[PDB]
Amino acid sequence: GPLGSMSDRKAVIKNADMSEDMQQDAVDCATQAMEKYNIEKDIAAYIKKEFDKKYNPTWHCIVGRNFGSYVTHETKHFIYFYLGQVAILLFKSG
Amino acid sequence: GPLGSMSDRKAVIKNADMSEDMQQDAVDCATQAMEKYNIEKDIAAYIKKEFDKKYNPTWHCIVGRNFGSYVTHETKHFIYFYLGQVAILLFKSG
Numbered sequence: 001g002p003l004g005s006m007s008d009r010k011a012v013i014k015n016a017d018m019s020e021d022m023q024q025d026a027v028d029c030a031t032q033a034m035e036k037y038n039i040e041k042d043i044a045a046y047i048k049k050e051f052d053k054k055y056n057p058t059w060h061c062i063v064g065r066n067f068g069s070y071v072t073h074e075t076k077h078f079i080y081f082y083l084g085q086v087a088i089l090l091f092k093s094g
Numbered sequence: 095g096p097l098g099s100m101s102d103r104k105a106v107i108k109n110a111d112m113s114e115d116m117q118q119d120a121v122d123c124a125t126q127a128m129e130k131y132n133i134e135k136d137i138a139a140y141i142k143k144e145f146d147k148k149y150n151p152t153w154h155c156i157v158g159r160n161f162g163s164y165v166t167h168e169t170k171h172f173i174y175f176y177l178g179q180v181a182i183l184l185f186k187s188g
Contacts, residue, residue, distance in 0.1 A: 062161055
């Protein structure tokens, strides 16, 4: 009975640092963007565009596999999860 | 010698927008960081740390496969290349 073989379309977050409302908004927006879109650039831009419009510019969304990017990061806007087979790294700094 | 033995890392840049001195510094620093380091987080942080120290904070380095990140970007500090089997996305905005 191995877990994560038939279906695992849920954010397996561990590196969440953003507020509970932010962690939920990221999983809610990404799941929705995943419904309307299915491209790393389309899902990352769609959720970032909404966060940039509501929370104001500029959000740093990074949806994908396992990139090793080194950038600006804050303890208020920083979260890293995994949606089935795509790791989202949502964090606002600029 | 131009021909190696098995490994042949060379930045196959196309999305270079940064100045000629910047495109060369990115390929020169990444090749060097590739010699000292061989991790997406280690190579991206090493080159970013040097660019952050010399060009001042904060550089947005993204070394890896094919992430679809949507963030801040300027026509002065924005470059995307490929080093053998790792795509570097160096761009300073914040």
